[PDB]
Design a binder for this molecule. Structure first.
Ligand SMILES: NS(=O)(=O)c1c2ccccc2cc2ccccc12
Ligand SMILES: [Zn+2]
Length: 258
């Protein structure tokens, strides 16, 4: 009886195995835009993905992960609120059964159709598994998706999904350029938080872009054909794989703009 998003093992149950679920810096959160304060000390974000080397795409039973070679310092995130440098390890999405839900963060209670998470670990801790044990171990860049015009740079991802339908399937996925998933503006909100799935560790500096990307209805429809189950098990569509907003508690959300 492992955790998931289903009728009986979803977010409201996670605290029994992972009591940090009720902690002081859980994610996601609602971003109340009027109260977030512009911080003139914040720096432009520096996203340097020109050497990013993707390897593989994996259906892990929760989402699909596009994995990167993180053995050389390529594909790094720095600046913004961060001290030091963070190396890209993977990206994944969260999405809904319906276009009206799917994001983890919300903006004045608005839910987007989906949310992309680009996960990076702080190189001062040597690898990902040590970084997640530190309060400044990860930086996750979050990007909202709305349904409208297709995102041309997303299509290669969409088209490989039929080959990783079920939990535990992977496929080779080289030469994918994540720059094609970025919006025009790098204006952002930032706050200290957590992983949004078990083990829910409080190790993340969140950087959530204000500008959403547009993807087409057909692109997001193909996300929703994935399955949470493994091959040869009854079909459970991979939809609604998002954790709801959690209490902000003693945190401030800062804006890079305005
Ligand atoms: N949302 S998260 O960044 O905490 C997260 C995941 C959430 C859903 C499914 C796959 C996920 C993969 C992650 C891998 C590394 C760090 C965070 C990850
Ligand atoms: Zn995520």
């Amino acid at each position: 009886h492992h955790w998931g998003y289903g009728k009986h093992n979803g977010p409201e149950h996670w605290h029994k195995d992972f009591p940090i679920a009720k902690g002081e810096r859980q994610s996601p959160v609602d971003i109340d835009t009027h109260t977030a304060k512009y911080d003139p000390s914040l720096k432009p974000l520096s996203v340097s993905y020109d050497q990013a080397t993707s390897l593989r795409i994996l259906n892990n039973g929760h989402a699909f992960n596009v994995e990167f070679d993180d053995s050389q310092d390529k594909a790094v995130l720095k600046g913004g609120p961060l001290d030091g440098t963070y190396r890209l390890i993977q990206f994944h999405f969260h999405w809904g059964s319906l276009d009206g839900q799917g994001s983890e963060h919300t903006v004045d209670k608005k839910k987007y159709a989906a949310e992309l998470h680009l996960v990076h670990w702080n190189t001062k801790y040597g690898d990902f598994g040590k970084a997640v044990q530190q309060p400044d171990g990860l930086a996750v860049l979050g990007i909202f998706l709305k349904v409208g015009s297709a995102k041309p740079g997303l299509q290669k991802v969409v088209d490989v999904l039929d080959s990783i339908k079920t939990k535990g399937k992977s496929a080779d996925f080289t030469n994918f350029d994540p720059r094609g998933l970025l919006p025009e503006s790098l204006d952002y909100w930032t706050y200290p938080g957590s992983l949004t799935t078990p083990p829910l560790l409080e190790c993340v500096t969140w950087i959530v872009l204000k500008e959403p990307i547009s993807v087409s209805s057909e692109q997001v429809l193909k996300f929703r054909k994935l399955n949470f189950n493994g091959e040869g098990e009854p079909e459970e569509l991979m939809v609604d794989n998002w954790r709801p907003a959690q209490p902000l508690k003693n945190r401030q959300i800062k804006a890079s703009f305005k």
